[PDB]
Design a protein around this nucleic acid. Structure first.
Ligand SMILES: NC[C@@H]1O[C@H](O[C@H]2[C@@H](O)[C@H](O[C@@H]3[C@@H](O)[C@H](N)C[C@H](N)[C@H]3O[C@H]3O[C@H](CO)[C@@H](O)[C@H](O)[C@H]3N)O[C@@H]2CO)[C@H](N)[C@@H](O)[C@@H]1O
Ligand SMILES: NC[C@@H]1O[C@H](O[C@H]2[C@@H](O)[C@H](O[C@@H]3[C@@H](O)[C@H](N)C[C@H](N)[C@H]3O[C@H]3O[C@H](CO)[C@@H](O)[C@H](O)[C@H]3N)O[C@@H]2CO)[C@H](N)[C@@H](O)[C@@H]1O
Ligand SMILES: NC[C@@H]1O[C@H](O[C@H]2[C@@H](O)[C@H](O[C@@H]3[C@@H](O)[C@H](N)C[C@H](N)[C@H]3O[C@H]3O[C@H](CO)[C@@H](O)[C@H](O)[C@H]3N)O[C@@H]2CO)[C@H](N)[C@@H](O)[C@@H]1O
Ligand SMILES: NC[C@@H]1O[C@H](O[C@H]2[C@@H](O)[C@H](O[C@@H]3[C@@H](O)[C@H](N)C[C@H](N)[C@H]3O[C@H]3O[C@H](CO)[C@@H](O)[C@H](O)[C@H]3N)O[C@@H]2CO)[C@H](N)[C@@H](O)[C@@H]1O
Ligand SMILES: [Mg+2]
Ligand SMILES: [Mg+2]
Ligand SMILES: [Mg+2]
Ligand SMILES: [Mg+2]
Ligand SMILES: [Mg+2]
Ligand SMILES: [Mg+2]
Ligand SMILES: [Mg+2]
Ligand SMILES: [Mg+2]
Ligand SMILES: [Mg+2]
Ligand SMILES: [Mg+2]
Ligand SMILES: [Mg+2]
Ligand SMILES: [Mg+2]
Ligand SMILES: [Mg+2]
Ligand SMILES: [Mg+2]
Ligand SMILES: [Mg+2]
Ligand SMILES: [Mg+2]
Ligand SMILES: [Mg+2]
Ligand SMILES: [Mg+2]
Ligand SMILES: [Mg+2]
Ligand SMILES: [Mg+2]
Ligand SMILES: [Mg+2]
Ligand SMILES: [Mg+2]
Ligand SMILES: [Mg+2]
Ligand SMILES: [Mg+2]
Ligand SMILES: [Mg+2]
Ligand SMILES: [Mg+2]
Ligand SMILES: [Mg+2]
Ligand SMILES: [Mg+2]
Ligand SMILES: [Mg+2]
Ligand SMILES: [Mg+2]
Ligand SMILES: [Mg+2]
Ligand SMILES: [Mg+2]
Ligand SMILES: [Mg+2]
Ligand SMILES: [Mg+2]
Ligand SMILES: [Mg+2]
Ligand SMILES: [Mg+2]
Ligand SMILES: [Mg+2]
Ligand SMILES: [Mg+2]
Ligand SMILES: [Mg+2]
Ligand SMILES: [Mg+2]
Ligand SMILES: [Mg+2]
Ligand SMILES: [Mg+2]
Ligand SMILES: [Mg+2]
Ligand SMILES: [Mg+2]
Ligand SMILES: [Mg+2]
Ligand SMILES: [Mg+2]
Ligand SMILES: [Mg+2]
Ligand SMILES: [Mg+2]
Ligand SMILES: [Mg+2]
Ligand SMILES: [Mg+2]
Ligand SMILES: [Mg+2]
Ligand SMILES: [Mg+2]
Ligand SMILES: [Mg+2]
Ligand SMILES: [Mg+2]
Ligand SMILES: [Mg+2]
Ligand SMILES: [Mg+2]
Ligand SMILES: [Mg+2]
Ligand SMILES: [Mg+2]
Ligand SMILES: [Mg+2]
Ligand SMILES: [Mg+2]
Ligand SMILES: [Mg+2]
Ligand SMILES: [Mg+2]
Ligand SMILES: [Mg+2]
Ligand SMILES: [Mg+2]
Ligand SMILES: [Mg+2]
Ligand SMILES: [Mg+2]
Ligand SMILES: [Mg+2]
Ligand SMILES: [Mg+2]
Ligand SMILES: [Mg+2]
Ligand SMILES: [Mg+2]
Ligand SMILES: [Mg+2]
Ligand SMILES: [Mg+2]
Ligand SMILES: [Mg+2]
Ligand SMILES: [Mg+2]
Ligand SMILES: [Mg+2]
Ligand SMILES: [Mg+2]
Ligand SMILES: [Mg+2]
Ligand SMILES: [Mg+2]
Ligand SMILES: [Mg+2]
Ligand SMILES: [Mg+2]
Ligand SMILES: [Mg+2]
Ligand SMILES: [Mg+2]
Ligand SMILES: [Mg+2]
Ligand SMILES: [Mg+2]
Ligand SMILES: [Mg+2]
Ligand SMILES: [Mg+2]
Ligand SMILES: [Mg+2]
Ligand SMILES: [Mg+2]
Ligand SMILES: [Mg+2]
Ligand SMILES: [Mg+2]
Ligand SMILES: [Mg+2]
Ligand SMILES: [Mg+2]
Ligand SMILES: [Mg+2]
Ligand SMILES: [Mg+2]
Ligand SMILES: [Mg+2]
Ligand SMILES: [Mg+2]
Ligand SMILES: [Mg+2]
Ligand SMILES: [Mg+2]
Ligand SMILES: [Mg+2]
Ligand SMILES: [Mg+2]
Ligand SMILES: [Mg+2]
Ligand SMILES: [Mg+2]
Ligand SMILES: [Mg+2]
Ligand SMILES: [Mg+2]
Ligand SMILES: [Mg+2]
Ligand SMILES: [Mg+2]
Ligand SMILES: [Mg+2]
Ligand SMILES: [Mg+2]
Ligand SMILES: [Mg+2]
Ligand SMILES: [Mg+2]
Ligand SMILES: [Mg+2]
Ligand SMILES: [Mg+2]
Ligand SMILES: [Mg+2]
Ligand SMILES: [Mg+2]
Ligand SMILES: [Mg+2]
Ligand SMILES: [Mg+2]
Ligand SMILES: [Mg+2]
Ligand SMILES: [Mg+2]
Ligand SMILES: [Mg+2]
Ligand SMILES: [Mg+2]
Ligand SMILES: [Mg+2]
Ligand SMILES: [Mg+2]
Ligand SMILES: [Mg+2]
Ligand SMILES: [Mg+2]
Ligand SMILES: [Mg+2]
Ligand SMILES: [Mg+2]
Ligand SMILES: [Mg+2]
Ligand SMILES: [Mg+2]
Ligand SMILES: [Mg+2]
Ligand SMILES: [Mg+2]
Ligand SMILES: [Mg+2]
Ligand SMILES: [Mg+2]
Ligand SMILES: [Mg+2]
Ligand SMILES: [Mg+2]
Ligand SMILES: [Mg+2]
Ligand SMILES: [Mg+2]
Ligand SMILES: [Mg+2]
Ligand SMILES: [Mg+2]
Ligand SMILES: [Mg+2]
Ligand SMILES: [Mg+2]
Ligand SMILES: [Mg+2]
Ligand SMILES: [Mg+2]
Ligand SMILES: [Mg+2]
Ligand SMILES: [Mg+2]
Ligand SMILES: [Mg+2]
Ligand SMILES: [Mg+2]
Ligand SMILES: [Mg+2]
Ligand SMILES: [Mg+2]
Ligand SMILES: [Mg+2]
Ligand SMILES: [Mg+2]
Ligand SMILES: [Mg+2]
Ligand SMILES: [Mg+2]
Ligand SMILES: [Mg+2]
Ligand SMILES: [Mg+2]
Ligand SMILES: [Mg+2]
Ligand SMILES: [Mg+2]
Ligand SMILES: [Mg+2]
Ligand SMILES: [Mg+2]
Ligand SMILES: [Zn+2]
Lengths: 49, 105
RNA sequence: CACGGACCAAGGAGUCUAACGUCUAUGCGAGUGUUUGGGUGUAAAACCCAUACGCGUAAUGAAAGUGAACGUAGGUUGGGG
RNA sequence: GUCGAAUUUGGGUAUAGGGGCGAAAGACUAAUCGAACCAUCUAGUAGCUGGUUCCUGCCGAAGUUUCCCUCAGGAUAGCAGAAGCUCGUAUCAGUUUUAUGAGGUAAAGCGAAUGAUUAGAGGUUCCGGGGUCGACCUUGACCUAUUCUCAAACUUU
RNA sequence: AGAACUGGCGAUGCGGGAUGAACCGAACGUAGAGUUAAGGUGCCGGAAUACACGCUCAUCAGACACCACAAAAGGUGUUAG
RNA sequence: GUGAUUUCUGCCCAGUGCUCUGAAUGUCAAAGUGAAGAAAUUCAACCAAGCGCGGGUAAACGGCGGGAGUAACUAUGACU
RNA sequence: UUGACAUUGUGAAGAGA
RNA sequence: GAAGACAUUGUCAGGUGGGGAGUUUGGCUGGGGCGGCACAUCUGUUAAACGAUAACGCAGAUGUCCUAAGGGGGGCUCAUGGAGAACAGAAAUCUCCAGUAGAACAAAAGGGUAAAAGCCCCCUUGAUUUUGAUUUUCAGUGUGAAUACAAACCAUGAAAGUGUGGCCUAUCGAUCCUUUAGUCCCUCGGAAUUUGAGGCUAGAGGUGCCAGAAAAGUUACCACAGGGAUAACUGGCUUGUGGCAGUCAAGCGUUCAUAGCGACAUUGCUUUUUGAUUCUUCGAUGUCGGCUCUUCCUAUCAUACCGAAGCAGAAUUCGGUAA
């Protein structure tokens, strides 16, 4: 999605390739806004066994 | 400005037309009841769909507001309204200044 | 060294409508308007007509209201005839 | 460039316009795509370009005032045409004369105020401060009459 | 670039400035004759290669408002003072 | 999201988001109750999520400084 | 998503100013 | 079997909601933008001796402040300087003389004022009621501000008088709505009483883009109507800037102004620099450099002929006719 144009995906903002706003979306988010880490409780590398 | 809490001025009371003593208060506007016709016309407009209807002011350039002095007749009880010029600070019954005083402390 | 126009013919752009202002012509005139309708007919014409209605004959107040002669319907100064 | 596989391909079939479809170019969706094609609302609105059809006769402008989300536009007054009407030299006049006001520009003034500005001379500080000596000379500060040159925001005149 | 006053151009041809929005002269029905303006009168070109006193010789002389540029500084060129 | 293999992937959760069987009365609708009223109404209390508070979270979006002291010529600054 | 009202019937304890 | 008056379905209510829908995102402007306010105003000057008068002209100022810094009376006279007094010194408080304003009057500036308009003290609330007229701006509308009255009712002083805010020139606000006071008034139209509401007059809450919309961005994916009223090449005026050259000759050059040079100044040219401007072209004049080729300029690098030298020769340097 970060590779598309803004029409095709919220990520699709260009001129560099970056998401530009938090990649963690709410649960109460609306169809069409939900892309990326959806209900995400936490994020990043864990190493939790 | 500093104004006194009392002044002797002409009264329009039909019982006494002459300079009387007046309790000098300051104006504050009322609660603006919901049943004034405009407000129930507005709430009509405001309903349904179509979002905001009457405008919403934004561009305000005023620092102050004009100070309206209500004067209540001590005897005949009838109130009259008087308005001041613009001021940033207004106190009624403020402490009169005094000349020649040592600059304090 | 700004734009349209290679040429010819034909076509090609301030209209009608409703409500109005000034002005003018006309009818009648403190009145006026036959044509909604009816009568009538040589039949969309022409001719004719009741009741109404519209505007005018009073203004002024937001409104309840009130409602225009002291005087040859006034005084002074002009004024054509 | 690739050429035995994410290979090339027929036909059948599916997804349709703020929709599809996209190994992502805003690409593709019938020579049409940063929103298809068709008809209608639609003679859409245009302070913006363009055009606007016979002849003669008389008169004859404006780009200024004020207000405007006013500055390529309006309203407004002015300039202009027409229609006239009341009267017949009543009244006037982009002119002078005489009488009587008002003005502070040009010029002028700075040994007048103000502000600026060159030069000496005289006179108190007996110094503001240091020296020469167990009070005399420099420095400045003031003061007096002079001298050169200035003013849109100086000025008697 | 921007004000003041008036005159103009625009909206206007005519004669003059060769040429030309705005300069000079003059403003315009159709014509004849006379006279002029501004400008001209060697030849182009209508009009004295007119009269008069001087000055000027330039191996880019100069030649007429607006107007189509030249300065300081020099010259034992020549002229007057 | 990143983009084979190898190797490594640091610091920062204050912000913007995401997330939490985390303290609260702080704010907080409509229905509901209470008070006053002849009623229309006014006035209160109580109160959901949310906000507000608190916790976590950067292979979430993203961030990684300006100053000065300081070692025997100078210089630099392992040090504060 | 949250509350209310209605779909909405039948019972029991034990608690709130 | 599970599940159970939960849930689901329904209707309101609060929250969330660029996923989606609309819409919007000033003006002036030596192009736009950025800045700025020349957008509402005030003083001085520009302004050309009535009045008016422009530029993003020059020096400044305003969105305030004051129960007195308003109103009246009275006494008094201020800047500043000289000469004089325990500590007391430059600076304390006291005195006399001088003192046309050289001070003060909120503030910008200008004007105005000396038995005051200043300082000081005394009393008051004309910073009030009513409602018209007049001046500035002007359309002779509004608004702001102001002037002279009338009708009341007050202050002040012995009084005559003066006072309708601040000595004068600036210090501000429509309709719609809300709101408060006033008249105790009108109306809710089948008739009444109360509550509520709607009026009349007068204030306030504000529009500073100040005659008064309710408003964020991006587009190199772009679009339309126009514009040479307008920027980005040429060309045109200008020549500050850039380039080139004069004049005077203090000085340089051992000596010696000028062989060769040249400060302070000053007169110029040029348009292969850059600006300034915005006339031409926006229904289109192909935008850098190079290559190629022609021709012109001369402010001459070489070459021909020369003059000068601080030219012995050699070299060099200055110059003339030369493109
Ligand atoms: N020659 C005398 C001088 O000039 C004048 O005197 C007289 C005339 O020269 C002067 O004429 C002036 C004229 O200059 C200029 N146009 C101004 C003004 N409009 C004229 O004056 C006249 O104007 C019109 C009539 O024309 C009248 O309505 C007006 O009342 C009258 N004063 O009008 C003056 C009175 O009739 C000045 N008053 C004065 O300088 C002095 O007397
Ligand atoms: N006023 C009458 C006229 O005065 C004229 O004379 C004028 C001048 O001569 C005279 O100037 C005198 C001067 O003469 C005398 N020697 C010195 C004196 N200070 C000057 O005085 C004048 O100038 C000074 C400024 O210099 C001003 O401050 C002063 O007010 C002014 N009057 O001032 C006079 C004007 O005030 C003529 N004599 C004549 O036309 C007639 O008499
Ligand atoms: N040159 C002397 C010194 O310079 C100044 O003073 C000089 C001037 O300022 C002063 O000039 C005169 C004066 O003589 C005379 N008596 C009084 C006059 N007002 C002064 O005027 C001076 O100032 C005014 C502006 O205020 C100027 O307009 C005027 O041109 C100027 N001369 O006199 C001095 C000589 O002309 C200093 N004030 C002072 O130290 C001392 O006098
Ligand atoms: N080379 C061998 C000889 O030397 C000769 O000698 C010449 C050179 O040494 C020197 O000439 C110089 C030259 O060096 C330099 N590069 C150019 C400069 N313009 C010349 O200058 C000379 O010659 C020119 C033109 O002829 C003259 O106008 C000038 O007066 C003269 N000084 O000066 C001599 C001529 O005056 C020539 N170079 C050459 O022709 C001859 O055969
Ligand atoms: Mg892309
Ligand atoms: Mg998006
Ligand atoms: Mg992006
Ligand atoms: Mg990109
Ligand atoms: Mg890119
Ligand atoms: Mg990347
Ligand atoms: Mg990335
Ligand atoms: Mg987002
Ligand atoms: Mg009485
Ligand atoms: Mg409703
Ligand atoms: Mg609703
Ligand atoms: Mg009042
Ligand atoms: Mg007032
Ligand atoms: Mg041309
Ligand atoms: Mg065109
Ligand atoms: Mg053409
Ligand atoms: Mg063409
Ligand atoms: Mg054609
Ligand atoms: Mg053509
Ligand atoms: Mg042909
Ligand atoms: Mg008619
Ligand atoms: Mg028939
Ligand atoms: Mg009738
Ligand atoms: Mg009566
Ligand atoms: Mg009678
Ligand atoms: Mg009469
Ligand atoms: Mg008579
Ligand atoms: Mg390849
Ligand atoms: Mg191969
Ligand atoms: Mg296929
Ligand atoms: Mg469709
Ligand atoms: Mg759309
Ligand atoms: Mg679908
Ligand atoms: Mg593909
Ligand atoms: Mg793209
Ligand atoms: Mg096609
Ligand atoms: Mg296609
Ligand atoms: Mg394409
Ligand atoms: Mg598009
Ligand atoms: Mg299609
Ligand atoms: Mg087709
Ligand atoms: Mg049409
Ligand atoms: Mg239509
Ligand atoms: Mg229209
Ligand atoms: Mg326009
Ligand atoms: Mg506006
Ligand atoms: Mg045009
Ligand atoms: Mg007109
Ligand atoms: Mg007329
Ligand atoms: Mg006179
Ligand atoms: Mg003067
Ligand atoms: Mg003047
Ligand atoms: Mg002068
Ligand atoms: Mg003089
Ligand atoms: Mg003075
Ligand atoms: Mg003074
Ligand atoms: Mg001396
Ligand atoms: Mg005299
Ligand atoms: Mg000009
Ligand atoms: Mg003039
Ligand atoms: Mg002229
Ligand atoms: Mg004309
Ligand atoms: Mg003419
Ligand atoms: Mg001619
Ligand atoms: Mg000529
Ligand atoms: Mg001519
Ligand atoms: Mg002349
Ligand atoms: Mg001849
Ligand atoms: Mg001549
Ligand atoms: Mg010439
Ligand atoms: Mg030329
Ligand atoms: Mg010459
Ligand atoms: Mg000469
Ligand atoms: Mg000579
Ligand atoms: Mg000689
Ligand atoms: Mg001689
Ligand atoms: Mg990632
Ligand atoms: Mg990649
Ligand atoms: Mg990391
Ligand atoms: Mg953080
Ligand atoms: Mg955080
Ligand atoms: Mg946290
Ligand atoms: Mg509630
Ligand atoms: Mg309940
Ligand atoms: Mg929860
Ligand atoms: Mg903690
Ligand atoms: Mg951050
Ligand atoms: Mg830094
Ligand atoms: Mg650091
Ligand atoms: Mg440092
Ligand atoms: Mg450092
Ligand atoms: Mg250091
Ligand atoms: Mg240390
Ligand atoms: Mg150190
Ligand atoms: Mg060290
Ligand atoms: Mg060291
Ligand atoms: Mg360090
Ligand atoms: Mg260091
Ligand atoms: Mg540390
Ligand atoms: Mg629910
Ligand atoms: Mg519940
Ligand atoms: Mg229930
Ligand atoms: Mg239960
Ligand atoms: Mg959204
Ligand atoms: Mg949108
Ligand atoms: Mg603009
Ligand atoms: Mg913009
Ligand atoms: Mg700007
Ligand atoms: Mg105005
Ligand atoms: Mg004003
Ligand atoms: Mg003037
Ligand atoms: Mg004047
Ligand atoms: Mg007095
Ligand atoms: Mg004195
Ligand atoms: Mg003085
Ligand atoms: Mg006073
Ligand atoms: Mg003053
Ligand atoms: Mg004064
Ligand atoms: Mg006096
Ligand atoms: Mg009296
Ligand atoms: Mg009075
Ligand atoms: Mg006032
Ligand atoms: Mg108001
Ligand atoms: Mg009201
Ligand atoms: Mg009342
Ligand atoms: Mg009733
Ligand atoms: Mg009723
Ligand atoms: Mg009532
Ligand atoms: Mg309002
Ligand atoms: Mg508004
Ligand atoms: Mg505006
Ligand atoms: Mg602004
Ligand atoms: Mg305006
Ligand atoms: Mg947009
Ligand atoms: Mg540009
Ligand atoms: Mg130059
Ligand atoms: Mg030039
Ligand atoms: Mg130069
Ligand atoms: Mg050159
Ligand atoms: Mg020497
Ligand atoms: Mg020599
Ligand atoms: Mg340069
Ligand atoms: Mg142009
Ligand atoms: Mg140009
Ligand atoms: Mg063209
Ligand atoms: Mg073009
Ligand atoms: Mg072409
Ligand atoms: Mg060509
Ligand atoms: Mg092309
Ligand atoms: Mg170019
Ligand atoms: Mg030459
Ligand atoms: Mg040579
Ligand atoms: Mg060379
Ligand atoms: Mg020698
Ligand atoms: Mg050599
Ligand atoms: Mg050589
Ligand atoms: Mg040379
Ligand atoms: Mg050649
Ligand atoms: Zn009373």
């Amino acid at each position: 999605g970060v590779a598309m144009n803004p029409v095709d995906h919220p990520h699709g903002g260009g001129n560099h390739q970056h998401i530009g706003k938090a990649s963690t979306i709410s649960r109460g988010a609306v169809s069409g806004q939900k892309a990326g880490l959806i209900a995400a409780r936490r994020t990043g590398l864990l190493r939790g066994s | 400005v500093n104004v006194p809490k009392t002044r002797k001025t002409y009264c329009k009371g039909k019982t006494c037309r002459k300079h009387t003593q007046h309790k000098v208060t300051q104006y504050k506007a009322g609660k603006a009841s919901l049943f004034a016709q405009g407000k129930r016309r507005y709430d009509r407009k405001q309903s349904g769909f179509g979002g905001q209807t009457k405008p919403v002011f934004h561009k305000k350039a005023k620092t102050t507001k004009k100070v309206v002095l209500r004067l209540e007749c001590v005897k005949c009880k009838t109130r009259a309204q008087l308005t001041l010029k613009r001021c940033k600070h207004f106190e009624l019954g403020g402490e009169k200044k005094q000349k020649g005083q040592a600059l304090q402390f």
